[PDB]
């Protein structure tokens, strides 16, 4: 069919995002224009990957040598909500609810062997009901993660796992747990944990907080493609200094999400069972739309 431009949703990784109305159903959607037959099959399979904490992929339209994705619309992203919450911060019970829900979404995707690989606050969408949902799952495997977007914007490295930075080709579901750990820390402290501005600055910021990794904490790290023996050797800091005022349960969970060795890093399923979630609730956020 055809939809209106409404109000240019925003510039995505792969192309423009539109708010649009479907003229037959009346539903309001997010329409993503993507700037190739393998990609078509892989993205089409995501129409079946349905979960309450995953932004629904309604349709995949291939036409005029152009690809459009139609998604469920949500009014707010976590980046905007964090910016708007800057003076007081997001309350801990809402941080906990959001982390719990995001782990549920990851556990679902990971159980179906689907990775996100580019989690960031801009692709975590929230509604008035206290839900949060992951957007753009599965697209990285289909299209890659570019250095720059279609409008030349720099794709953020802030949430990238260290095995990706060190050149591992066959990374795993653990990369999404890393990203989510970085987002958890940012919600708590109201500052990005590792705001690198180049691949080496990203790695060195990780090393300055968590210690330079070695064969003791990460067997095999020194044989990684981009590992260099000349990396400076930084000591690892206490989480008590990194994410105040997070309690011991939260610091324990964050430490397990930020293990260097992707095999040691907690799974989404195991994280759901962590004592941090013993008192989880689902509060109502204050949203001004």
mmCIF file of C-alpha atoms in Angstrom:
data_model
loop_
_atom_site.group_PDB
_atom_site.id
_atom_site.type_symbol
_atom_site.label_atom_id
_atom_site.label_comp_id
_atom_site.label_asym_id
_atom_site.label_seq_id
_atom_site.Cartn_x
_atom_site.Cartn_y
_atom_site.Cartn_z
ATOM 1 C CA UNK A 1 0.000 0.000 0.000
ATOM 2 C CA UNK A 2 1.364 3.476 0.964
ATOM 3 C CA UNK A 3 1.826 5.545 4.186
ATOM 4 C CA UNK A 4 2.463 9.264 4.976
ATOM 5 C CA UNK A 5 5.825 10.693 6.212
ATOM 6 C CA UNK A 6 4.086 11.908 9.441
ATOM 7 C CA UNK A 7 7.278 13.291 11.104
ATOM 8 C CA UNK A 8 10.627 11.789 9.918
ATOM 9 C CA UNK A 9 11.166 9.281 12.806
ATOM 10 C CA UNK A 10 14.979 9.712 12.562
ATOM 11 C CA UNK A 11 18.195 8.707 10.729
ATOM 12 C CA UNK A 12 18.854 5.016 11.477
ATOM 13 C CA UNK A 13 22.043 2.996 10.892
ATOM 14 C CA UNK A 14 20.782 1.854 7.432
ATOM 15 C CA UNK A 15 18.392 4.599 6.239
ATOM 16 C CA UNK A 16 15.650 7.055 7.112
ATOM 17 C CA UNK A 17 13.017 6.047 9.743
ATOM 18 C CA UNK A 18 9.457 7.358 9.216
ATOM 19 C CA UNK A 19 6.419 7.378 11.447
ATOM 20 C CA UNK A 20 3.621 6.304 9.010
ATOM 21 C CA UNK A 21 -0.105 5.300 9.005
ATOM 22 C CA UNK A 22 -1.244 2.165 7.070
ATOM 23 C CA UNK A 23 -4.285 3.465 5.145
ATOM 24 C CA UNK A 24 -6.319 0.163 5.124
ATOM 25 C CA UNK A 25 -5.699 -0.968 8.790
ATOM 26 C CA UNK A 26 -5.206 2.578 10.235
ATOM 27 C CA UNK A 27 -2.196 1.290 12.252
ATOM 28 C CA UNK A 28 0.665 3.708 13.023
ATOM 29 C CA UNK A 29 4.071 2.092 12.298
ATOM 30 C CA UNK A 30 7.785 2.806 12.051
ATOM 31 C CA UNK A 31 8.951 2.449 8.432
ATOM 32 C CA UNK A 32 12.713 1.947 7.895
ATOM 33 C CA UNK A 33 14.273 2.434 4.433
ATOM 34 C CA UNK A 34 17.415 0.193 4.046
ATOM 35 C CA UNK A 35 20.130 1.490 1.578
ATOM 36 C CA UNK A 36 20.695 -8.616 -2.113
ATOM 37 C CA UNK A 37 18.998 -12.048 -1.745
ATOM 38 C CA UNK A 38 20.873 -13.527 1.318
ATOM 39 C CA UNK A 39 19.758 -10.411 3.373
ATOM 40 C CA UNK A 40 16.121 -10.799 2.177
ATOM 41 C CA UNK A 41 15.841 -14.407 3.367
ATOM 42 C CA UNK A 42 17.570 -13.701 6.737
ATOM 43 C CA UNK A 43 15.452 -10.598 7.539
ATOM 44 C CA UNK A 44 12.217 -12.342 6.413
ATOM 45 C CA UNK A 45 12.795 -15.090 9.074
ATOM 46 C CA UNK A 46 12.716 -12.327 11.791
ATOM 47 C CA UNK A 47 8.935 -11.900 11.137
ATOM 48 C CA UNK A 48 8.487 -15.080 13.237
ATOM 49 C CA UNK A 49 10.787 -13.931 16.143
ATOM 50 C CA UNK A 50 7.947 -12.506 18.281
ATOM 51 C CA UNK A 51 8.183 -11.608 21.982
ATOM 52 C CA UNK A 52 6.722 -8.850 24.180
ATOM 53 C CA UNK A 53 10.171 -7.294 24.711
ATOM 54 C CA UNK A 54 11.125 -7.318 20.964
ATOM 55 C CA UNK A 55 9.816 -4.587 18.684
ATOM 56 C CA UNK A 56 7.541 -6.450 16.268
ATOM 57 C CA UNK A 57 8.699 -6.745 12.603
ATOM 58 C CA UNK A 58 5.326 -6.459 10.809
ATOM 59 C CA UNK A 59 6.509 -6.679 7.158
ATOM 60 C CA UNK A 60 9.549 -6.806 4.829
ATOM 61 C CA UNK A 61 8.868 -4.954 1.507
ATOM 62 C CA UNK A 62 11.423 -5.458 -1.381
ATOM 63 C CA UNK A 63 10.641 -3.101 -4.346
ATOM 64 C CA UNK A 64 12.362 -0.882 -6.989
ATOM 65 C CA UNK A 65 15.714 -2.382 -5.762
ATOM 66 C CA UNK A 66 14.855 -0.924 -2.306
ATOM 67 C CA UNK A 67 14.055 -2.644 1.059
ATOM 68 C CA UNK A 68 11.563 -1.303 3.666
ATOM 69 C CA UNK A 69 10.982 -2.747 7.114
ATOM 70 C CA UNK A 70 7.670 -2.067 8.878
ATOM 71 C CA UNK A 71 7.904 -2.168 12.669
ATOM 72 C CA UNK A 72 5.585 -1.660 15.612
ATOM 73 C CA UNK A 73 5.749 2.009 16.690
ATOM 74 C CA UNK A 74 6.828 3.101 20.174
ATOM 75 C CA UNK A 75 6.915 6.750 21.214
ATOM 76 C CA UNK A 76 10.243 7.055 23.113
ATOM 77 C CA UNK A 77 13.778 5.552 23.170
ATOM 78 C CA UNK A 78 15.866 4.989 26.296
ATOM 79 C CA UNK A 79 18.474 7.545 25.147
ATOM 80 C CA UNK A 80 15.856 10.322 25.149
ATOM 81 C CA UNK A 81 14.355 9.044 28.466
ATOM 82 C CA UNK A 82 17.821 9.012 30.108
ATOM 83 C CA UNK A 83 18.556 12.575 28.818
ATOM 84 C CA UNK A 84 15.110 13.710 30.167
ATOM 85 C CA UNK A 85 15.816 11.917 33.544
ATOM 86 C CA UNK A 86 19.318 13.507 33.860
ATOM 87 C CA UNK A 87 18.597 15.717 36.939
ATOM 88 C CA UNK A 88 17.213 12.922 39.229
ATOM 89 C CA UNK A 89 18.195 9.797 37.270
ATOM 90 C CA UNK A 90 15.900 6.871 36.459
ATOM 91 C CA UNK A 91 14.643 5.374 39.765
ATOM 92 C CA UNK A 92 16.354 2.034 40.679
ATOM 93 C CA UNK A 93 13.067 0.074 40.594
ATOM 94 C CA UNK A 94 12.503 1.202 36.976
ATOM 95 C CA UNK A 95 16.176 0.493 36.045
ATOM 96 C CA UNK A 96 15.674 -3.013 37.515
ATOM 97 C CA UNK A 97 12.376 -3.511 35.620
ATOM 98 C CA UNK A 98 13.958 -2.392 32.345
ATOM 99 C CA UNK A 99 17.019 -4.633 32.796
ATOM 100 C CA UNK A 100 14.783 -7.611 33.665
ATOM 101 C CA UNK A 101 12.618 -7.065 30.580
ATOM 102 C CA UNK A 102 15.636 -6.592 28.285
ATOM 103 C CA UNK A 103 17.168 -9.844 29.612
ATOM 104 C CA UNK A 104 13.870 -11.586 28.832
ATOM 105 C CA UNK A 105 14.026 -10.306 25.261
ATOM 106 C CA UNK A 106 17.653 -11.388 24.890
ATOM 107 C CA UNK A 107 16.973 -14.821 26.439
ATOM 108 C CA UNK A 108 14.204 -15.312 23.853
ATOM 109 C CA UNK A 109 16.300 -14.212 20.839
ATOM 110 C CA UNK A 110 19.373 -16.136 22.020
ATOM 111 C CA UNK A 111 17.265 -19.310 22.496
ATOM 112 C CA UNK A 112 16.367 -18.991 18.723
ATOM 113 C CA UNK A 113 20.082 -18.421 17.829
ATOM 114 C CA UNK A 114 19.498 -14.753 16.906
ATOM 115 C CA UNK A 115 21.993 -12.100 18.057
ATOM 116 C CA UNK A 116 21.497 -8.317 18.059
ATOM 117 C CA UNK A 117 25.249 -7.307 18.026
ATOM 118 C CA UNK A 118 24.502 -3.532 18.063
ATOM 119 C CA UNK A 119 22.516 -2.851 21.246
ATOM 120 C CA UNK A 120 22.525 0.786 22.341
ATOM 121 C CA UNK A 121 20.083 3.102 24.167
ATOM 122 C CA UNK A 122 18.755 4.468 20.832
ATOM 123 C CA UNK A 123 17.398 0.956 19.915
ATOM 124 C CA UNK A 124 15.704 0.321 23.259
ATOM 125 C CA UNK A 125 12.135 1.636 22.956
ATOM 126 C CA UNK A 126 9.740 2.400 25.822
ATOM 127 C CA UNK A 127 5.978 2.890 26.180
ATOM 128 C CA UNK A 128 3.635 4.494 28.755
ATOM 129 C CA UNK A 129 2.777 1.008 30.253
ATOM 130 C CA UNK A 130 6.323 0.443 31.720
ATOM 131 C CA UNK A 131 7.494 -1.863 28.889
ATOM 132 C CA UNK A 132 10.855 -1.665 27.112
ATOM 133 C CA UNK A 133 11.603 -3.472 23.855
ATOM 134 C CA UNK A 134 14.672 -4.228 21.736
ATOM 135 C CA UNK A 135 14.603 -2.788 18.197
ATOM 136 C CA UNK A 136 16.658 -3.942 15.166
ATOM 137 C CA UNK A 137 17.412 -7.524 16.394
ATOM 138 C CA UNK A 138 18.898 -9.682 13.624
ATOM 139 C CA UNK A 139 19.689 -6.771 11.244
ATOM 140 C CA UNK A 140 23.469 -6.755 11.868
ATOM 141 C CA UNK A 141 23.812 -10.414 10.703
ATOM 142 C CA UNK A 142 21.780 -9.450 7.571
ATOM 143 C CA UNK A 143 23.421 -6.090 6.649
ATOM 144 C CA UNK A 144 26.635 -5.761 8.743
ATOM 145 C CA UNK A 145 27.442 -2.923 11.222
ATOM 146 C CA UNK A 146 28.988 -0.072 9.198
ATOM 147 C CA UNK A 147 31.637 2.407 10.510
ATOM 148 C CA UNK A 148 29.327 5.290 9.381
ATOM 149 C CA UNK A 149 25.569 5.477 8.760
ATOM 150 C CA UNK A 150 23.988 6.367 5.421
ATOM 151 C CA UNK A 151 24.153 10.105 6.553
ATOM 152 C CA UNK A 152 27.894 9.731 7.559
ATOM 153 C CA UNK A 153 27.077 9.694 11.324
ATOM 154 C CA UNK A 154 29.607 7.647 13.340
ATOM 155 C CA UNK A 155 28.157 4.337 14.607
ATOM 156 C CA UNK A 156 28.856 4.270 18.348
ATOM 157 C CA UNK A 157 31.533 1.910 19.710
ATOM 158 C CA UNK A 158 30.541 2.552 23.347
ATOM 159 C CA UNK A 159 28.653 -0.756 23.797
ATOM 160 C CA UNK A 160 30.951 -3.003 21.734
ATOM 161 C CA UNK A 161 32.278 -6.167 23.411
ATOM 162 C CA UNK A 162 36.046 -6.581 23.716
ATOM 163 C CA UNK A 163 36.156 -9.780 21.645
ATOM 164 C CA UNK A 164 34.734 -7.781 18.672
ATOM 165 C CA UNK A 165 37.310 -4.994 19.217
ATOM 166 C CA UNK A 166 40.122 -7.653 19.357
ATOM 167 C CA UNK A 167 39.091 -9.091 15.972
ATOM 168 C CA UNK A 168 37.223 -12.286 16.946
ATOM 169 C CA UNK A 169 35.259 -13.308 13.852
ATOM 170 C CA UNK A 170 32.873 -15.875 15.530
ATOM 171 C CA UNK A 171 31.407 -13.991 18.424
ATOM 172 C CA UNK A 172 28.435 -15.204 20.280
ATOM 173 C CA UNK A 173 25.343 -14.184 22.236
ATOM 174 C CA UNK A 174 27.745 -12.917 24.930
ATOM 175 C CA UNK A 175 28.279 -9.733 22.890
ATOM 176 C CA UNK A 176 24.707 -8.649 23.675
ATOM 177 C CA UNK A 177 25.160 -9.290 27.411
ATOM 178 C CA UNK A 178 28.225 -7.022 27.337
ATOM 179 C CA UNK A 179 26.284 -4.249 25.634
ATOM 180 C CA UNK A 180 23.409 -4.568 28.078
ATOM 181 C CA UNK A 181 25.846 -4.407 31.014
ATOM 182 C CA UNK A 182 27.223 -1.151 29.654
ATOM 183 C CA UNK A 183 23.668 0.205 29.346
ATOM 184 C CA UNK A 184 22.809 -0.903 32.908
ATOM 185 C CA UNK A 185 25.822 1.020 34.215
ATOM 186 C CA UNK A 186 24.824 4.114 32.210
ATOM 187 C CA UNK A 187 21.261 4.052 33.619
ATOM 188 C CA UNK A 188 22.666 3.893 37.190
ATOM 189 C CA UNK A 189 25.456 6.507 36.910
ATOM 190 C CA UNK A 190 23.850 8.790 34.258
ATOM 191 C CA UNK A 191 27.119 8.695 32.235
ATOM 192 C CA UNK A 192 28.281 6.259 29.523
ATOM 193 C CA UNK A 193 30.612 3.637 31.015
ATOM 194 C CA UNK A 194 33.100 3.399 28.086
ATOM 195 C CA UNK A 195 32.576 6.387 25.714
ATOM 196 C CA UNK A 196 35.358 5.620 23.267
ATOM 197 C CA UNK A 197 35.877 7.700 20.167
ATOM 198 C CA UNK A 198 37.996 5.180 18.207
ATOM 199 C CA UNK A 199 38.543 1.449 18.385
ATOM 200 C CA UNK A 200 41.776 1.787 20.452
ATOM 201 C CA UNK A 201 40.228 4.437 22.742
ATOM 202 C CA UNK A 202 37.288 2.088 23.275
ATOM 203 C CA UNK A 203 39.584 -0.820 24.162
ATOM 204 C CA UNK A 204 41.846 1.273 26.408
ATOM 205 C CA UNK A 205 38.831 2.699 28.281
ATOM 206 C CA UNK A 206 37.671 -0.864 28.938
ATOM 207 C CA UNK A 207 41.184 -1.816 30.059
ATOM 208 C CA UNK A 208 41.548 1.214 32.391
ATOM 209 C CA UNK A 209 38.370 0.155 34.278
ATOM 210 C CA UNK A 210 38.426 -3.646 34.133
ATOM 211 C CA UNK A 211 42.241 -4.152 33.891
ATOM 212 C CA UNK A 212 44.206 -5.083 30.802
ATOM 213 C CA UNK A 213 43.090 -8.655 30.061
ATOM 214 C CA UNK A 214 45.627 -11.477 30.222
ATOM 215 C CA UNK A 215 45.688 -15.244 29.879
ATOM 216 C CA UNK A 216 44.683 -15.626 33.599
ATOM 217 C CA UNK A 217 41.277 -13.904 33.169
ATOM 218 C CA UNK A 218 40.812 -14.657 29.434
ATOM 219 C CA UNK A 219 42.532 -17.792 28.126
ATOM 220 C CA UNK A 220 43.358 -17.267 24.442
ATOM 221 C CA UNK A 221 43.214 -13.445 24.532
ATOM 222 C CA UNK A 222 46.909 -12.998 23.588
ATOM 223 C CA UNK A 223 46.250 -15.000 20.323
ATOM 224 C CA UNK A 224 43.349 -12.742 19.212
ATOM 225 C CA UNK A 225 43.870 -11.155 15.757
ATOM 226 C CA UNK A 226 44.113 -7.512 16.990
ATOM 227 C CA UNK A 227 45.773 -8.231 20.371
ATOM 228 C CA UNK A 228 49.164 -6.548 20.732
ATOM 229 C CA UNK A 229 51.677 -7.392 23.428
ATOM 230 C CA UNK A 230 52.488 -3.643 23.596
ATOM 231 C CA UNK A 231 49.049 -2.831 25.098
ATOM 232 C CA UNK A 232 49.605 -0.924 28.360
ATOM 233 C CA UNK A 233 48.977 -3.003 31.538
ATOM 234 C CA UNK A 234 46.341 -1.243 33.698
ATOM 235 C CA UNK A 235 45.103 -2.579 37.051
ATOM 236 C CA UNK A 236 41.358 -3.365 37.448
ATOM 237 C CA UNK A 237 39.184 -0.893 39.512
ATOM 238 C CA UNK A 238 36.501 -1.839 42.157
ATOM 239 C CA UNK A 239 32.880 -1.716 40.843
ATOM 240 C CA UNK A 240 32.113 0.226 44.050
ATOM 241 C CA UNK A 241 34.027 3.124 42.386
ATOM 242 C CA UNK A 242 32.677 2.514 38.831
ATOM 243 C CA UNK A 243 28.888 2.331 39.482
ATOM 244 C CA UNK A 244 28.008 4.056 42.788
ATOM 245 C CA UNK A 245 25.398 3.899 44.351
ATOM 246 C CA UNK A 246 24.502 0.419 43.026
ATOM 247 C CA UNK A 247 24.102 -2.245 45.767
ATOM 248 C CA UNK A 248 26.101 -5.453 46.058
ATOM 249 C CA UNK A 249 23.522 -7.527 44.142
ATOM 250 C CA UNK A 250 23.599 -5.099 41.202
ATOM 251 C CA UNK A 251 27.415 -4.834 41.242
ATOM 252 C CA UNK A 252 27.672 -8.670 41.338
ATOM 253 C CA UNK A 253 25.356 -8.986 38.304
ATOM 254 C CA UNK A 254 27.144 -6.194 36.399
ATOM 255 C CA UNK A 255 30.537 -7.835 37.045
ATOM 256 C CA UNK A 256 29.214 -11.094 35.532
ATOM 257 C CA UNK A 257 27.854 -9.220 32.487
ATOM 258 C CA UNK A 258 31.278 -7.584 31.972
ATOM 259 C CA UNK A 259 33.515 -10.644 32.283
ATOM 260 C CA UNK A 260 36.213 -10.453 29.605
ATOM 261 C CA UNK A 261 35.999 -14.137 28.616
ATOM 262 C CA UNK A 262 32.785 -14.494 26.586
ATOM 263 C CA UNK A 263 32.499 -18.106 27.861
ATOM 264 C CA UNK A 264 32.471 -16.905 31.506
ATOM 265 C CA UNK A 265 30.088 -13.959 30.852
ATOM 266 C CA UNK A 266 26.627 -14.639 32.340
ATOM 267 C CA UNK A 267 23.870 -15.758 29.938
ATOM 268 C CA UNK A 268 20.571 -13.854 29.730
ATOM 269 C CA UNK A 269 18.729 -16.898 31.181
ATOM 270 C CA UNK A 270 21.123 -17.150 34.160
ATOM 271 C CA UNK A 271 20.987 -13.370 34.715
ATOM 272 C CA UNK A 272 17.169 -13.585 35.099
ATOM 273 C CA UNK A 273 17.753 -15.908 38.114
ATOM 274 C CA UNK A 274 20.249 -13.494 39.789
ATOM 275 C CA UNK A 275 19.364 -12.286 43.339
ATOM 276 C CA UNK A 276 19.255 -8.670 41.992
ATOM 277 C CA UNK A 277 15.796 -9.517 40.560
ATOM 278 C CA UNK A 278 14.345 -11.001 43.794
ATOM 279 C CA UNK A 279 12.316 -7.771 44.386
ATOM 280 C CA UNK A 280 11.669 -6.800 40.725
ATOM 281 C CA UNK A 281 8.463 -4.868 39.984
ATOM 282 C CA UNK A 282 7.027 -3.086 36.911
ATOM 283 C CA UNK A 283 6.717 0.634 37.704
ATOM 284 C CA UNK A 284 5.022 3.306 35.451
ATOM 285 C CA UNK A 285 7.546 5.749 33.977
ATOM 286 C CA UNK A 286 6.583 9.439 33.821
ATOM 287 C CA UNK A 287 6.464 10.005 30.005
ATOM 288 C CA UNK A 288 5.711 13.392 28.403
ATOM 289 C CA UNK A 289 4.860 12.628 24.715
#
